[PDB]
């Protein structure tokens, strides 16, 4: 869920 | 060291350095040999 | 394929002993360890020695020997040009020399340390090359040019506002400095570097958190300029331009006290070429 | 007076302090973001 | 002052071994200048070529100043730093600037 | 001016160009 | 809903030319990409082209008039010809002769229009594809300094001759003259800030390029897919800069650093140049009152004399 | 369709405006007519 | 192809490189002879050491 | 689909009118032919 | 969902107050209006 | 979810105190109002 | 195969001839040896 | 686990003390109030 | 591990950290005593407050 | 778990001692207070 | 495989010959030893 | 491991680090004695406090 | 393909050409020999 | 593993060499001895 | 396991070469021997 850019995508 | 490649690299490096310094040396020897000294002022 | 890793596994996986330059020369690195986050080695001890000594000598020359607590009013100056290339502990410029030498060691040590780290992670040697360009800038300004001129008094003073008085006086002694061709090339490369940095930052930020493909940015950069460079070529161009900017500026400052004395006279040949000399009349001659 | 003029503080020292402090804060937040836990490829498999 | 040497103006000055045909402004010294620029001798010195900090002056006057200043340092065989400290051009800390004021008045 | 020391210093200034040239040549050779 | 093929291979005014595309080999070998074209032309790209070439036509015809319509003297003297703004005796007036400032005014107006329409083109083409409008605002920050140099500083000073001439040598001359007029520009503190940001931008560009090329065996330069899951190259770059400096960055926020370091240069430059003539008429004297000038009582001037 | 009407309209309108502005600038600089004089 | 090139320098030269190297050395020797003759003639014209 | 767009023409007209107004005001007021804002 | 965070308000207020206080102190010090730290 | 951590408060307060002490000592020393460190 | 293309040689020859002709004409005109184009 | 580490405190204290000692020695030597290192 | 520490300071100290803390505090006390003596001697030499 | 490593502490102490010795010797040599290594 | 392509050798030799011819012509013309395009 | 280290310093030192530590402390004592002698001799030569 | 031989011969040819040009200009500008005199 | 003898040998040799060079340079530049003088 | 006599031989040879170069340069460029000018 947690991603390098700071976005938490499903 | 054991292969021919390393020996060639070392010899090429030393040859290039000595050729550069000797070229500069002979250039300046010829220059100072043939070039006249400047005239002193009046 | 991809999961959440806490970056401790990442750091622990890549730590290995002994793949540096000292490990290849002596067979072992005497300082092959880490302190905190930093990696110490040979050339990490030498660099830190140089850093501490340079800071201490700079502050001793500024606070003592000048009696000022204002950091913007210090003139850490070299010896006069009448002293030649001689060093004397009983003469005013001595501490400047010490500071200069220490800085050189620090800078050179830093460079070599980078190579060591590049060898530990199995990388290329691009960062040492790009940094060695500006280390050569320092060496040209403080070592080669004063030796060719013949005195240590041709180097720059190390004050925060006073090293700019040297730049102003040197630039107006060889007037006009704008007419130096290598100077123009260096300024062109600096401006191009800043433009390229802004363009790359904008391009990567404009596609970050979006449900698009990787081909949208190519179509964008091809609709506007007619050419898109690619992802390996943007970063290659960045590296090359950044290095060349200072590489070309080394010549401009080296050739000023040697081989040249006036950059307005340098162009005196241009109007005297046989193709177009002797073709106008009045204020249109030459 | 041994003191600068008021525009010396307004034009020189406040921007200097602002630049230094902003650099420190931006570096702190950049490093905090970069060393956190998020999606990465496994170093053991990927190498 | 006596520190300049005490040399005198004679016939060979201003003539250099020629009777007529003297050229005050040869084509060899017009290298970066228009080939009709002449020294502005209708002004008063000091004050004729001062530009620093003036709001009744613009880049046209600064260009006219720079033409004369390059003529001067071609005529001395020197750079700008012979008469100036380049960190402040209004400064009078080099004696050659006063010598040059006297020589502008003479010419 | 010595003119012999100045030439060696000029050669050092020029040899400072070498790593970038080698980088360009490496890029050209390794990408046929 | 974006069809990239239609966005690149359409006809009309709202379409592209230079189709079918070309291919340059040495660009493919050195840079990795070799395709040139097609290039979009629209309404904002035809208004920029025509206005730019109107201004260029005016400048080049005036060059020819100054030379005397002689092609050989034109070639000889090309790099030191210029079109200059009206002298100081006129104010901001437009009732100036053509050979004493009218051509400069016309050409500058057309150049203003061209740069504005180019900004519009960047904005609209960013929205036509699916990307954000970050190049447009970077160009706006760059244009702030341009409009201070050519429009606002002359307006606040009260004459057009405070603006640069149109030529190869005239921009260097403008730089020299403007620094000489207002004291010394080295003691301008926003000049110091601008230099800080410019040299930092060059530092950062060299660093980023070198570190991405160094780790390119593991495809670290594909920064679009690295911002979703990081692989071995990005991990190695992070470890390199952590073991060198003590702190590192991401494959995302490094380009944030890049954008802001490049943007601050132009903004600080605009502020410094605008303040240069209107509030502080002498920067060395100001720096002397602000305690940032070193005394220097006994200079060794033998260095500066031949 | 080889020729588009919109391109013709845009190009002709822009050229007309550019020419009008240029002629006005030239005539103002000439000083022949009184116009905006002192 | 490694033929007609002695085994000592086989890890360095091919046969085409061997032919090019032979041409180069012959050119060098001819140039050296001509240079010696030129220097002798120039000395006979005007000696530079006195 | 539509050969001409109304929104584009509106934007272009507004920008052109603003630019012309600014240019004419500056040209007219800097000539010195009118008695406007005189100390 | 709150429009603002309390932490941001606290940090902004503290920073603004500190900068304002330092500026006012140093502006008043160099004016010469008050005796204060006078040699 | 606390708004503030104690560690950041401690670090900020300590650095602010040290910087303020150094600044006030420098200003008081550079005024000439006290016979302190005069020769 | 073929080391050179005929098109490249034709282009190079044409460009070289044109440049040479222009250069020689300019040198002769500027020399002043021939009457030619005189006022 | 714990807000502060003992090692960081030791390191920071040592660095600060060393820097302060060197700075105070240089300032007191520069002041000229003591007959400390004179020819 | 966390057994030689007093019960109050368990959440902050270990055994080794406790020992190193004790060493550091004794060193600090000795340094303070020496610093006081040095200042008293310097004042007896030349007072710096006049 | 010990807070420090012994080898690193030895290295740091040795480095500090060497730097201190060099600094003090170079400061004393050029002060001119002692008749040592005088030309 | 070949150490040198024939095309590169031809191109280099042609360019060198042209440059040398131009250089010698200009040096000899500028020397003034021959009459050539006088008046 | 630690068998000849004293009981008090077991969680801090090793079997070889104890020996290296003893060598270091003896080095420091000798250096301090030599430094004191050197300072006394230099003061007898020319006092630096006047 | 090895890069040593071609690089060596190229650098040798460049050095020889540059040295010959430099020596010829130095001798010409000295006036020791008659050569190209007015 | 720690305090290996070879590393200590390397460190000692490097430090001795550097110190010898430094002291020779300092004594030569002091000008106190009549050594390598004109 | 990683130690060998070749390492010591190589290190000592390179060190001797560097020291010989440095001593030649220092001695030649001095008041005595005056760069062999005499
Ligand atoms: C007129 C001025 C006088 C003079 C007046 C004074 C006065 C007054 C003082 C000194 C003090 C000192 N002087 Mg004195 N001194 C003079 C001239 C000299 C000269 C010289 C060549 O002229 C020298 C070499 C010295 C040397 C010294 C030092 C021995 C000492 C500073 C200790 C220190 O660095 O603390 C810093 C050391 C550190 C290791 C930094 C750490 C300290 C911090 C603050 C606390 C943390 C401790 C740490 C956590 C413990 C862990 C263990 C460590 C890792 C080892 N002085 C002249 C003659 N000097 C000071 C002193 O006596 O201190 C004992 C002092 O008060
Ligand atoms: C630094 C140079 C060399 C080296 C040079 C020497 C020399 C020389 C000697 C040794 C000796 C020894 N070395 Mg060793 N040794 C080195 C590296 C090592 C390393 C290592 C981990 O790398 C180790 C474990 C050792 C270990 C040892 C011991 C086997 C042995 C005995 C020490 C002792 O008795 O403690 C006691 C420890 C002390 C430090 C004594 C204190 C003296 C100090 C140094 C004072 C300064 C000297 C001063 C001029 C005289 C005394 C002052 C007065 C008090 C006023 N060496 C390095 C590579 N070593 C000694 C021996 O007996 O040889 C077999 C000996 O003489
Ligand atoms: C004697 C010379 C003076 C000096 C006088 C000045 C003056 C006057 C100025 C500067 C300014 C600057 N100086 Mg300075 N400067 C000096 C010495 C230095 C030194 C040095 C090492 O000595 C350095 C590094 C600098 C560096 C700088 C820059 C930081 C800064 C301008 C950068 C910039 O953003 O340009 C980039 C330029 C732009 C962004 C505007 C132009 C481009 C825009 C984007 C429009 C272009 C579109 C175009 C029309 C399209 C046509 C192209 C088509 C493709 C064909 N100066 C000394 C003191 N300097 C400027 C400044 O900012 O002041 C604070 C300025 O005005
Ligand atoms: C006589 C007046 C001057 C003098 C003037 C010159 C001039 C002028 C030159 C030399 C050159 C040389 N001089 Mg001498 N020289 C002088 C005194 C000396 C003294 C001395 C102790 O007195 C020494 C040691 C030398 C030594 C040298 C050598 C470095 C060199 C001769 C080697 C060579 O070129 O062959 C090496 C052989 C080759 C490199 C083979 C290459 C040649 C082939 C044949 C190609 C020739 C090019 C040809 C024109 C191309 C035509 C192509 C066709 C049309 C297809 N000179 C005196 C003081 N000297 C020459 C030089 O530096 O050349 C590099 C040179 O040009
Ligand atoms: C006479 C006064 C001058 C002189 C002035 C000129 C001028 C001026 C020129 C020459 C040119 C030449 N001169 Mg001459 N020349 C002089 C003395 C010399 C001396 C000497 C030892 O003194 C020599 C060796 C030469 C040698 C030469 C040749 C290199 C060249 C003629 C051959 C050639 O290649 O063009 C022959 C051309 C071809 C083989 C190609 C055919 C071109 C065709 C005819 C196309 C022409 C374009 C046409 C006008 C367009 C109309 C097309 C229609 C619309 C269809 N000159 C003296 C000093 N010389 C010319 C040159 O350099 O040309 C390259 C040249 O322009
Ligand atoms: C006398 C003239 C100067 C003066 C000149 C110097 C000089 C010069 C030096 C000192 C040093 C010292 N001075 Mg003093 N000093 C002065 C006045 C003072 C005053 C004062 C209040 O007046 C104070 C507090 C001091 C304090 C000090 C200490 C900081 C230090 C001595 C203690 C030490 O570190 O242990 C001594 C050292 C050790 C315990 C380390 C162990 C050393 C071992 C023996 C290694 C020696 C190297 C050896 C040759 C190599 C090994 C052998 C090989 C295998 C062959 N000085 C006056 C102003 N001072 C020294 C220093 O800074 O040392 C770090 C130093 O070099
Ligand atoms: C003009 C006289 C100068 C002087 C100028 C020089 C110069 C120049 C040199 C020395 C060198 C030496 N000098 Mg001295 N020297 C002077 C005054 C002194 C004083 C003094 C107190 O006055 C001292 C103690 C010394 C001491 C020394 C030694 C450090 C060294 C002794 C040579 C040696 O060890 O063999 C060295 C050789 C061996 C141990 C064996 C080497 C093996 C082979 C036989 C060497 C040939 C190699 C050769 C390059 C060929 C390479 C082979 C191929 C690559 C295959 N000199 C005076 C001021 N001295 C030399 C040096 O630094 O050497 C390290 C050196 O080059
Ligand atoms: C002066 C310079 C003299 C040395 C010239 C070397 C030329 C060949 C280098 C090369 O290009 O070596 C090729 C190698 C490897 O190649 P790669 O990493 O591209 O392979 C990529 C595989 N994936 O890179 C290097 O060694 C980098 C060298 C780093 C240092 C260069 C800059 C430092 C010297 C400049 C001067 C700075 C001060 C020096 C101290 C006084
Ligand atoms: C610089 C201020 C001069 C000094 C010093 C002397 N002369 Fe001169 N003189 C000067 C100029 C600019 C000219 C005009 C030259 C021209 O091209 O017309 C002259 C001219 C003369 C002449 C007349 C020349 C002629 O008619 O052909 C004479 C006879 C003459 N000058 C004499 C002269 C003497 C004797 C001087 C020393 C006492 C002397 N001049 C000094 C400028 C200057
Ligand atoms: C001695 C022959 C000089 C040379 C060489 C240069 N300058 Fe100079 N400068 C000189 C004088 C005698 C004066 C005073 C002019 C006056 O009418 O009073 C000046 C003046 C300037 C100024 C303006 C000073 C001011 O107060 O604003 C500037 C900006 C200036 N000069 C610049 C300058 C430059 C750029 C030079 C190198 C080309 C240069 N000067 C040389 C004397 C001499
Ligand atoms: C390199 C700088 C611009 C010069 C371009 C023309 C030089 C020759 O360019 C050739 C290309 O034509 C060829 O396609 C590639 C390999 O595909 O190799 C290059 O050397
Ligand atoms: C709309 C853009 C701003 C317009 C501001 C116009 C400023 C006019 O300023 C003019 C000067 O430029 C002119 O030289 C004199 C003539 O005496 O009169 C003034 O009013
Ligand atoms: Ca001219
Ligand atoms: Mn990137």
What string of H, E and C letters represents the secondary structure of chain C? CEEEECCHHHHHHCCCCCCCHHHHHCCCCCCCEEECCEEECCCCHHHHHHHHHHHHHHHHHHHCCCCCCCCCCCCCCCCCHHHCCCCCCCCCCHHHHHHHHHHHHHHHHHHHHHHHHHHHCCCCCHHHHHHHHHHHHHHHHHHHHHHHHCCHHHCCCCCCCCHHHHHHHHHHHCCCHHHCHHHHHHHHHHHHHHHHHHHHHHHHHCCCCCCCCCCHHHHHHHHHCCECCCCHHHHHHHHHHHHHHHHHHHHHHHHHHCCCCCCCHHHHHHHHCCCCCCCCCCCCCC
Residue in chain H lying closest to J4 (CA): H6
Can you tell me the distance from the alpha carbon of C206 to that of S23, in angstroms, rounded to the nearest whole number?
A: 59
H or E element in which residue R37 lies: helix R17-45
Enumerate the β-bridge partners of residue E26: none
- G91 Cβ closer than 6 Å to some ligand 12 atom: yes
Enumerate the β-bridge partners of residue C3: D40
H or E element in which residue D40 lies: strand D38-41
| CA distance to C286, Q19, S16, S28, S31, per residue, from Q27 (Å) | 21, 12, 20, 10, 15
Cα–Cα–Cα angle for R28, R32, R37, rounded to 5 degrees? 150
Residues 6+ apart with CB under 8 A from E54: G181, G281
* Chains touching M, CB cut-off 8 Å, 3+ pairs: C, G, Q
Pairing of strands G15-17, G39-41: antiparallel
Identify from J3, J17, J29 which residue to disrupt to test chain H contact, counting H C-beta atoms within 10 A and taking the largest count.
J3
User: Tokens for E76?
Assistant: 């001395």
Pairs of residues, one from chain T and one from chain U, whose beta carbons lie less than 8 Å apart: 11
Q: How far is CA C121 from the centre of its chain?
A: 25
Can you tell me the distance from the alpha carbon of C24 to that of E23, in angstroms, rounded to the nearest whole number?
A: 73
Of the listed ligands, the closest to the CA of C191 is 3
Q: Which of B27, C227, T22, L2 is nearest to F4 (CA)?
A: B27
Q: Is C250 exposed, middle or buried (0-12, 13-18, 19+ CB in 10 A)?
A: buried
Residue G83 main-chain phi, psi, to 5 deg:
-110, 120
Q: Interhelix angle for P6-31 vs R17-45, to 10°?
A: 10
H or E element in which residue P21 lies: helix P6-31
Neighbours of B21 (CB within 10 A): 12
Can you tell me the distance from the alpha carbon of S17 to that of R49, in angstroms, rounded to the nearest whole number?
A: 71
> Which residue in H11, H21, H30 is closest to G46 by CB distance?
H11
Q: Which of C244, G16, G243 is nearest to C252 (CA)?
A: C244
Can you tell me the distance from the alpha carbon of N34 to that of E88, in angstroms, rounded to the nearest whole number?
A: 39
Overall residue count recorded for chain C in this entry = 286
Torsion of CA N12, N14, N15, N21, to 10 degrees: 140
> Which residue in G13, G98, G105 is closest to H6 by CB distance?
G13
Q: Which of F28, G194, G196, F18 is nearest to C247 (CA)?
A: F18
Overall residue count recorded for chain O in this entry = 50
| Upper half-sphere CA count for residue L34 (Cβ side, 13 Å) | 12
Flag whether residue C140 sits within 8 Å of chain G, measured between CB atoms. no
Contact C99, C54 (CB under 8 A): yes
Q: Which of C46, C110, G171 is nearest to P18 (CA)?
A: C46
Distance from CA of P1 to the nearest CA of C (A): 16
Q: Which of C82, C81, C252, C77 is nearest to C174 (CA)?
A: C252
J18 is in an annotated binding site: no
Neighbours of G74 (CB within 10 A): 17
Can you tell me the distance from the alpha carbon of G181 to that of E52, in angstroms, rounded to the nearest whole number?
A: 5
Can you tell me the distance from the alpha carbon of E107 to that of T23, in angstroms, rounded to the nearest whole number?
A: 62
Can you tell me the distance from the alpha carbon of C117 to that of C41, in angstroms, rounded to the nearest whole number?
A: 10
Cα–Cα–Cα angle for C183, C185, C191, rounded to 5 degrees? 105
End-to-end CA distance of chain K: 58
Residue with tokens 């060093």: C87
- E68 Cβ closer than 6 Å to some ligand 10 atom: no
The answer to whether the CB atoms of G102 and H10 lie below 8 A apart is: no
Contact C20, C112 (CB under 8 A): no
Pairing of strands C33-35, G39-41: unpaired
Give the largest Cα separation in chain P, rounded.
57
User: Tokens for C238?
Assistant: 């960045």
DSSP 3-state of E88: strand
DSSP string, chain G: ---HHHHHS--SSSEEES-S-EE-HHHHHHHS--EE--EEE-SHHHHHHHHHHHHHHHHHHHHHHHHTS-HHHHHHTGGG--B----TTS-S-S---GGGTHHHHHHHHHHHHHHHHHHHHHHHHHHHTT--S-HHHHHHHHHHHHHIIIIIHHHHHT-GGGSPPBSTTHHHHHHHHHHHHSS-GGG-HHHHHHHHHHHHHHHHHHHHHHHHHHTGGGTTT-HHHHTTSB-HHHHHHHHHHHHHHS----TTTHHHHHHHHHHHHHHHHHHHHHHHHHT-S-HHHHHHHTT-S----S--GGGG--
Can you tell me the distance from the alpha carbon of G213 to that of G29, in angstroms, rounded to the nearest whole number?
A: 15
Contact C49, P19 (CB under 8 A): yes
Can you tell me the distance from the alpha carbon of C179 to that of G169, in angstroms, rounded to the nearest whole number?
A: 9
- SS3 of chain L: helix, strand, coil, percent, to 5: 60, 5, 35
Contact C196, G198 (CB under 8 A): no
User: Tokens for G228?
Assistant: 């979703």
Enumerate the β-bridge partners of residue G16: G40
Residues 6+ apart with CB under 8 A from C42: C20, C21, C22, C29, C30, C31, C116
DSSP 3-state of N10: helix
Can you tell me the distance from the alpha carbon of D31 to that of G237, in angstroms, rounded to the nearest whole number?
A: 14
User: Tokens for Q35?
Assistant: 């009459």
Positive or negative: CA dihedral G217, G222, G225, G229: positive
Resolution (A): 2.8
H or E element in which residue D41 lies: strand D38-41
* Residues of A in Cβ contact (< 8 Å) with C209: 5, 7
DSSP 3-state of D39: strand
Residue in chain H lying closest to J5 (CA): H6
Contact C243, C136 (CB under 8 A): no
Report residues near ion ligand 13: CB below 5 Å: E 30, 35
DSSP string, M1-39: --SS-HHHHHHHHHHHHHHHHHHHHHHHHHH--S-SS--
Residue with tokens 């001759």: G161
* Chains touching F, CB cut-off 8 Å, 3+ pairs: B, C, G
Q: Given the CA of residue S21, which atom of ligand 4 is nearest to it?
A: 66
H or E element in which residue D38 lies: strand D38-41
* DSSP class of L36: B
Method used to determine the 3D structure: cryo-EM
Can you tell me the distance from the alpha carbon of G270 to that of G144, in angstroms, rounded to the nearest whole number?
A: 7
Can you tell me the distance from the alpha carbon of C111 to that of C117, in angstroms, rounded to the nearest whole number?
A: 10
* Residues of D in Cβ contact (< 8 Å) with G191: none
* DSSP class of B38: P
> Which residue in N7, N37, N38 is closest to P4 by CB distance?
N7
* Residues of N in Cβ contact (< 8 Å) with P32: 39
- As annotated, the binding site of R includes 21, 29, 39, 48
Flag whether residue C226 sits within 8 Å of chain D, measured between CB atoms. no
Neighbours of C18 (CB within 10 A): 15
Q: Interhelix angle for G135-147 vs C181-205, to 10°?
A: 140
Flag whether residue A5 sits within 8 Å of chain C, measured between CB atoms. yes
Contact C72, G292 (CB under 8 A): yes
Positive or negative: CA dihedral G6, G7, G9, G15: positive
Three-state secondary structure of chain S? CCCHHHHHHHHHHHHHHHHHHHHHHHHHCCCCCCCCCC
Contact C265, C174 (CB under 8 A): no
Can you tell me the distance from the alpha carbon of C131 to that of C114, in angstroms, rounded to the nearest whole number?
A: 9
Residue E38 main-chain phi, psi, to 5 deg:
-130, 160
Residue C34 main-chain phi, psi, to 5 deg:
-115, 140
DSSP string, F14-29: HHTTHHHHHHHHHHHH
Contact C232, G216 (CB under 8 A): yes
Can you tell me the distance from the alpha carbon of C182 to that of C160, in angstroms, rounded to the nearest whole number?
A: 26
Examine residue C176 and say whether the peptide bond preceding it is cis (omega within 30 degrees of 0).
Answer: yes
Query: Per-residue b/e over J7-35, b at no fewer than 16 CB within 10 Å?
Result: eeeeebeeeeeeeeeeeeeebeebbeeee
* DSSP class of L38: -
Enumerate the β-bridge partners of residue C217: none
Enumerate the β-bridge partners of residue G36: C227, G22
Query: Per-residue b/e over O13-33, b at no fewer than 16 CB within 10 Å?
Result: bbbbbbbbbeeeeeeeeeeee
Our answer on whether Q and N touch (3+ beta-carbon pairs < 8 Å) is no
């Amino acid at each position: 869920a947690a991603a390098p850019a700071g976005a938490a995508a499903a | 060291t054991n292969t021919v490649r390393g020996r060639f690299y070392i010899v090429a490096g030393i040859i290039s350095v000595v050729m550069a310094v000797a070229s500069i040396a002979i250039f300046w020897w010829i220059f100072y040999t043939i070039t006249p000294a400047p005239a002193p002022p009046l | 394929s991809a999961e959440v890793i806490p970056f401790s596994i990442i750091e622990e996986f890549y730590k290995r002993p002994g793949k540096t330059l000292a490990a290849r020369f002596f067979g072992v690195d005497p300082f092959d360890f880490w302190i905190g986050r930093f990696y110490v080695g040979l050339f990490g001890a030498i660099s830190i020695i140089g850093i501490i000594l340079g800071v201490a000598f700079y502050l001793y020359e500024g606070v003592v020997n000048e009696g000022t607590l204002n950091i913007l009013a210090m003139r850490i100056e070299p010896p006069p040009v009448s002293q030649g290339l001689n060093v004397d502990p009983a003469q005013p410029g001595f501490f400047w020399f010490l500071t200069m030498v220490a800085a050189t060691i620090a800078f050179v040590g830093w460079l070599l340390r980078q190579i060591d780290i590049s060898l530990k992670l199995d990388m290329g040697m691009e960062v040492p090359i790009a940094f060695g360009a500006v280390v050569s800038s320092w060496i040209t300004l403080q070592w080669l040019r004063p030796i060719a001129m013949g005195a240590w008094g041709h180097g720059f003073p190390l004050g925060i506002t006073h090293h700019l008085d040297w730049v102003s006086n040197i630039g107006y002694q060889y007037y006009n400095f704008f007419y130096n061709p290598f100077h123009a090339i260096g300024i062109t490369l600096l401006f191009a570097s800043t433009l390229f940095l802004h363009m790359h930052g904008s391009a990567v930020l404009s596609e970050a958190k979006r449900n698009i493909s990787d081909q949208n940015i190519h179509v964008f950069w091809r609709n506007i300029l007619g050419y898109s460079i690619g992802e390996i070529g943007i970063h290659r161009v960045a590296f090359w331009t950044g290095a060349a900017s200072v590489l070309f500026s080394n010549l401009c400052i080296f050739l000023s006290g040697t081989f040249v004395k006036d950059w307005n006279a340098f162009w005196g040949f241009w109007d005297k070429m046989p193709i177009w000399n002797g073709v106008g009349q009045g204020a249109l001659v030459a | 007076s041994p003191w600068p003029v008021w525009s010396g503080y307004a034009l020189c020292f406040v921007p200097l302090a602002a630049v230094i402090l902003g650099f420190i804060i931006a570096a702190r937040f950049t490093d905090k973001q970069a060393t956190s836990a998020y999606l990465r490829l496994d170093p053991a498999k990927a190498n | 002052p006596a520190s300049v040497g005490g040399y005198q103006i004679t016939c060979a000055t201003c003539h250099n071994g020629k009777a007529a045909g003297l050229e005050p402004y040869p084509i060899e010294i017009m290298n970066t200048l228009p080939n009709d620029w002449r020294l502005p001798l209708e002004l008063d010195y000091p004050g004729g070529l001062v530009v620093t900090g003036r709001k009744d002056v613009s880049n046209h006057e600064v260009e006219q100043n720079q033409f004369a200043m390059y003529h001067m340092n071609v005529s001395m065989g020197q750079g700008c730093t012979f008469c100036h400290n380049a960190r402040y051009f209004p400064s009078y800390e080099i004696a050659q600037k006063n010598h040059s004021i006297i020589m502008l008045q003479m010419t | 001016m010595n003119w012999i020391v100045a030439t060696f210093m000029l050669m050092f200034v020029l040899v400072a160009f070498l790593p970038l040239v080698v980088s360009l040549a490496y890029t050209w050779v390794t990408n046929p | 809903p974006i069809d990239l093929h239609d966005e690149e291979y359409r006809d009309g005014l709202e379409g592209t030319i230079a189709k079918p595309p070309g291919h340059v080999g040495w660009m493919q070998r050195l840079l990795g990409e070799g395709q040139v074209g097609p290039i979009y032309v629209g309404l904002w790209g035809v208004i920029s082209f025509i206005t730019f070439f109107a201004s260029a036509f005016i400048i080049l015809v005036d060059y020819g008039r100054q030379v005397g319509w002689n092609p050989i003297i034109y070639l000889r003297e090309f790099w030191n010809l210029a079109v200059y703004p009206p002298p100081t005796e006129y104010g901001l007036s437009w009732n100036v002769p053509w050979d004493k400032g009218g051509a400069w005014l016309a050409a500058t107006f057309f150049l203003h229009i061209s740069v504005l329409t180019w900004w519009a083109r960047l904005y609209t083409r960013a929205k036509a594809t699916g990307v954000g409008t970050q190049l447009a605002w970077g160009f706006a920050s760059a244009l702030s300094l341009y409009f201070v140099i050519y429009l606002f500083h002359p307006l606040a000073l009260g004459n057009w001759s405070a603006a640069p001439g149109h030529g190869f040598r005239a921009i260097l001359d403008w730089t020299n003259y403007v620094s000489i007029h207002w004291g010394n520009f080295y003691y301008n503190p926003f000049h110091m800030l601008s230099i800080f940001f410019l040299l930092g931008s060059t530092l950062l560009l060299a660093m980023h390029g070198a570190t991405i090329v160094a780790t390119s065996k593991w495809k670290s330069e594909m920064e679009f897919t690295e911002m979703m899951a990081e692989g071995p190259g990005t991990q190695r770059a992070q470890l390199f800069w952590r073991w060198v400096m003590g702190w590192n960055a991401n494959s995302y926020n490094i380009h944030i650093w890049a954008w802001w370091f490049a943007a601050f240069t132009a903004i600080t430059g605009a502020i410094g140049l605008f303040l240069s003539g209107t509030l502080v008429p002498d920067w060395y004297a100001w720096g002397e009152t602000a305690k940032i000038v070193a005394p220097w009582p006994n200079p060794d001037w033998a260095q500066y004399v031949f | 369709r080889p020729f588009e009407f919109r391109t013709s309209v845009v190009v002709s309108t822009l050229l007309g405006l550019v020419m009008a502005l240029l002629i006005h600038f030239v005539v103002l600089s000439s000083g022949a007519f009184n116009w905006l004089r002192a | 192809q490694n033929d007609l090139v002695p085994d000592q320098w086989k890890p360095l030269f091919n046969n085409a490189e061997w032919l090019v190297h032979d041409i180069v050395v012959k050119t060098i020797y001819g140039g050296l002879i001509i240079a010696v003759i030129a220097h002798v003639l120039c000395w006979a014209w005007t000696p530079w050491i006195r």
